[PDB]
């Protein structure tokens, strides 16, 4: 095999994705649910939180291309997401750490969510389309 | 084995015409009178 000259350039994320932004998932068991972006992982996935205590969505890895960006942002500076890593999702039934870490993460974000009025209930409600909707026109 | 297209792929564009670097570094394409 010849020496292919293709360097692993780091991923470039679209400007519409910023930490603390409200994300919407279009695929998966949580499709249609509203989630909060936290950190970008080395595997090109997005670390997000429901938070779990609000809508039941735990910390999960998601792909940007399947996520619709929104202008609504919330503070995420107080959450120490450095603990999470790609190795934190390997498996080779819920693990004990998955509960305590999720609770700790949600404790530092439930207050911020409650700071903005109607944001808790807004996240608790699953997003869905309606008759006559025109996503291209809508800003989301 | 593969025909690199100039204009695009600036790396190959620099192979031919070394003055392209000076042209891009001096904005000669929009030079004022």
């Amino acid at each position: 095999l010849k020496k292919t000259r293709k360097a692993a350039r780091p991923q470039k994320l679209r400007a519409s994705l910023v930490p603390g932004t409200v994300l919407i998932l279009l695929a998966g068991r949580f499709r249609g649910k509203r989630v909060v972006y936290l950190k970008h992982l080395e595997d090109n996935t997005l670390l997000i939180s429901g938070p779990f205590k609000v809508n039941g969505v735990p910390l999960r890895r998601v792909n940007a291309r399947y996520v619709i960006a929104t202008s609504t942002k919330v503070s995420v500076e107080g959450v120490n997401v450095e603990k999470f890593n790609v190795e934190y999702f390997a498996k080779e039934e819920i693990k004990a750490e998955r509960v305590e870490d999720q609770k700790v993460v949600d404790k530092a974000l439930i207050a911020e969510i409650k700071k903005t009025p109607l944001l808790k209930q807004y996240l608790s409600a699953s997003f869905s389309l309606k008759n006559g909707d025109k996503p291209h026109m809508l800003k989301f | 084995v593969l025909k690199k297209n100039p204009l695009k792929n600036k790396q190959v564009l620099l192979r031919l015409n070394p003055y392209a670097k000076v042209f891009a570094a001096e904005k000669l394409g929009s030079k004022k009178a």
Binding site: - | L16, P18, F23, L28
Partner: protein, 222 residues
């Protein structure tokens, strides 16, 4: 052995010297083009200010593109196109402007479109579709050494030198044009525009002399 590094260093030094030579030549050509355009504009300004009409020089370079298919072509235009290397449709080459050639275009005018190109269009064509003829083979122009080896004796050692020779119609115009393989051009990106292509350009058609519009047409067909 010591050859592996010595030969590499020697060839790298020679290539660096040739690169500097080509750089200075390209800078000189660009300065000459800018000075010529500025002088032409200044002459036009002086003519306008002095209340006298301008005497623009005759167009010394033209480009012709085949517009009609081989079918039903009368023998004389077909022979003219064959001797002009305009065999397949949507193909063209640069030709010197003379009565010997203007009268030739007059015959093939119904089946071809032509005009006066420009520096930008010529450079784009030479860089993209520029193909050289070596040992009767078609070799794309991708390295200055390839052009230098075939036209080194004529003082051409880079793609910029070839473009300068083609645009200026210098003494080596014959060799520069012959070395260039006939240009393969696609159909216009935006279309021919006119609903009927087979008509004179001056009456809403396509074929015929269009002067500067040929530059626009080529870029869409490039």
């Amino acid at each position: 052995a010591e050859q592996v590094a010595a030969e590499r260093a020697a060839r790298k030094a020679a290539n660096k010297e040739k690169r500097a030579i080509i750089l200075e030549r390209n800078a000189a050509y660009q300065k000459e083009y800018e000075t010529a355009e500025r002088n032409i504009i200044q002459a036009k300004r002086d003519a306008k200010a002095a209340g006298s009409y301008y005497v623009e020089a005759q167009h010394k370079l033209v480009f012709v593109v085949r517009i009609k298919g081989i079918n039903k072509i009368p023998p004389k235009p077909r022979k003219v196109l064959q001797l002009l290397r305009l065999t397949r449709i949507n193909s063209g080459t640069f030709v010197k402007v003379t009565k010997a050639t203007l009268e030739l275009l007059k015959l093939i005018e119904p089946y071809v479109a032509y005009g006066y190109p420009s520096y930008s269009t010529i450079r784009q064509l030479v860089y993209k579709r520029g193909f050289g003829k070596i040992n009767k083979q078609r070799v794309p122009l991708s390295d200055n050494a390839i052009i230098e080896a075939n036209l080194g004796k004529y003082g051409i050692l880079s793609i910029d030198d070839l473009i300068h020779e083609i645009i200026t119609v210098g003494p080596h115009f014959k060799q520069a044009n012959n070395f260039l393989w006939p240009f393969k051009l696609s159909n216009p990106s935006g279309g021919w525009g006119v609903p009927r292509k087979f008509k004179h350009f001056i009456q809403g058609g396509s074929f015929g002399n269009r002067e500067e519009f040929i530059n626009k047409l080529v870029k869409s067909m490039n």
